[PDB]
Amino acid sequence: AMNRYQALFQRLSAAQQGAFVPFVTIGDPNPEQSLAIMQTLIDAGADALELGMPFSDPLADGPTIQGANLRALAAKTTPDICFELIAQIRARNPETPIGLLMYANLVYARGIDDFYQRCQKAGVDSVLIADVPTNESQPFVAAAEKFGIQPIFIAPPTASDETLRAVAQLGKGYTYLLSRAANMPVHALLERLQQFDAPPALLGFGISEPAQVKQAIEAGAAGAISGSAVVKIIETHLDNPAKQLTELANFTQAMKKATKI
Amino acid sequence: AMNRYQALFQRLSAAQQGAFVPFVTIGDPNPEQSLAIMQTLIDAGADALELGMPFSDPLADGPTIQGANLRALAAKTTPDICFELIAQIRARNPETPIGLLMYANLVYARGIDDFYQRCQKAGVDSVLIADVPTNESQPFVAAAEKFGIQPIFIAPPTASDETLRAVAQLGKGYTYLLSRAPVHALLERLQQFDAPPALLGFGISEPAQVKQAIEAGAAGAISGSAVVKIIETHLDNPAKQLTELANFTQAMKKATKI
């Protein structure tokens, strides 16, 4: 029977909407507030969550998500903590698809198979391994398959046929369409992905305005994902937890509204 | 019994100079030219090399290092090739220290022991694991010890004490600092804990930053992205690309005179 994303997309299409998926780092600014943040996103109309686990990368300091990683680490977030938090979100929201956007480091650290087992225990739907190409993805996918987890791949504009083949054969759930930006390349790739029979596309890069969401859907994507812009809201109101939440709800409502009509 | 870095710093100390260490991505812009680039850097007075292996991280924000990865990968650079190029540089330059700056991904991918064994075979002196904190570095430090490789760690200024005695204890070769020229202070504790000599690696792209690093008390400076930017801006003319790298490396090394 249908996985959570297959059902989401069919239900949304019947409602003539696309999907809005916000991204947050788990444990930012601390576990308890991160739990409130995740629930607030769901309650305000996020169609699924995309979630990152924190790790240190001092050479890459500066961008918003790295900023989140530092806060979560300062709060002593560990992967065990991240899985406990995901479990609680899953228990309270049994229908909401939950995807993880991981870097390989933490997935290898305690064994690949171990990681995906923990994913199944916590109720994760999908895992996107940000920094391993499709042609090296075999042990990730084998693990994902064993634990019923949908593998999510990135498909850049330049994607080769053998890359898109892999996406369609190995990937489930959705395809992460990274577009760093005239419209023809995006239109070309959406059409290509369908011809290869890949999972539905979410446009995922630099998406910060409601109009970008509406445009993604108009071009034919299934929805859009917003990284930085959700995390930025958390950073802007670090001093005031209550306003973090009301601003995250307001932003989420605006972005989800742009998925309609 | 001195590793390549100890023999280096002994020499540099006698010559009244600090260290200049450029960074490049192995195989950027293709393997043959990368081999010319590495030799050009050494010939032009680089005291050691810091070298990366390319991999794809399309979500990353960091255009210089990203473009280097993309270039090297489009030219079909693989880890096997990286080790072959390293071995050639080593044969031709028996004394020059060669440090790898790696992300964990590639080190785990075919096994940690395997990776450090290939470093040994290739004549690599040190490995810095960019994305694993000292207090999680046990399996890297063990494989490093097993195969005679020196582990290098980053000491961020935010870091405290036990993080910092761990860096001085576990680390060998040099210590990588992201402080800019707080820095007097952080260098003080490092030397107080017997850390390996400290190199400044944040935003070092002009000779005046190299002189400032040394004046500040550091043993030298690492230019983390500047050399890659010269590659990037002279892609259409390989011979010029090499002339610009020689000139830049010369001017950076000169700035190391105490």
What DSSP assignment string belongs to A66-101? HHHHHHHHHTT--HHHHHHHHHHHHHH-TTS-EEEE
Question: What letter represents residue A114's amino acid?
Answer: D
At B166, list the tokens: 């761990």
A133: exposed, middle or buried (Cβ count in 10 Å: 0-12, 13-18, 19+): middle
Q: Is A205 on the interface with B (CB under 8 A)?
A: yes
Q: Are A259 and A223 in contact (CB under 8 A)?
A: yes
Q: Mark whether B61 is an active-site residue.
A: yes
Alpha-carbon gap, residue A51 to A48, rounded angstroms: 10
CATH of the domain at B218: 3.20.20.70
Question: What letter represents residue A146's amino acid?
Answer: K
Taking only residues 173 to 192 of chain B, the set having a beta carbon closer than 8 angstroms to any beta carbon of chain A reads 178
B183: exposed, middle or buried (Cβ count in 10 Å: 0-12, 13-18, 19+): middle
Q: Are A234 and A34 in contact (CB under 8 A)?
A: no
Q: Are B28 and B54 in contact (CB under 8 A)?
A: yes
Beta strands in chain B (DSSP E): 19-25, 49-52, 98-102, 126-129, 150-152, 154-155, 175-177, 198-200, 220-223
Experimental method: X-ray
- Substitution target in B50, B56, B135, B228 with the highest count of A β-carbons within 10 Å is B56
Contact A56 B103 (CB under 8 A): no
Give the other-Cβ count within 10 Å of B182's Cβ.
Answer: 9
Number of residues that this document lists for chain B = 258
At A77, list the tokens: 């977030």
A102: exposed, middle or buried (Cβ count in 10 Å: 0-12, 13-18, 19+): buried
**B38 — phi, psi (to 5°)?**
-55, -40
Give the range of the structural domain holding residue A255, as residue numbers without chain letter. 1-261
Q: Are A171 and A152 in contact (CB under 8 A)?
A: yes
Alpha-carbon gap, residue B7 to B94, rounded angstroms: 12
- C-alpha closest to that of A22 among A45, A2, A3: A45
The minimal CB distance from A108 to the residues B58, B60, B108 is found for B108
At A248, list the tokens: 């995250």
Residue by residue, DSSP assigns A9-36 as HHHHHHTTB-EEEEEEETTSS-HHHHHH
- C-alpha closest to that of B223 among B77, B24, B36, B84: B24
Contact B224 A59 (CB under 8 A): yes
**A216 — phi, psi (to 5°)?**
-60, -45
At B215, list the tokens: 């004046």
Number of domains in chain B: 1
The answer, yes or no, to whether the previous bond of A29 is cis (omega within 30 of 0) is: yes
The answer, yes or no, to whether the previous bond of B29 is cis (omega within 30 of 0) is: yes
The conformation of residue B206, written as its DSSP 8-state character, comes to: S
Q: Which residues sit opposite B221 in a β-bridge?
A: B20, B200
- CB under 8 A, 24+ apart: contacts of A58-64: A58/B130, A58/B154, A58/B156, A58/B178, A59/B130, A59/B154, A59/B178, A59/B224, A60/B60, A60/B61, A60/B62, A61/B178, A62/B61, A63/A228, A63/B61, A64/A227, A64/A228, A64/A231, A64/A232, A64/A235
Residue by residue, DSSP assigns A105-151 as HHHHHT-HHHHHHHHHHHT--EEEETTS-GGG-HHHHHHHHHTTPEE
Q: Is A162 on the interface with B (CB under 8 A)?
A: no
Q: Are A109 and A66 in contact (CB under 8 A)?
A: no
Residue contacts between A and B (CB atoms, under 8 Å): 56
Element containing residue A223 per DSSP (H, E): strand A223-226
Q: Report CA B245 to chain centroid distance, whole Å.
A: 16
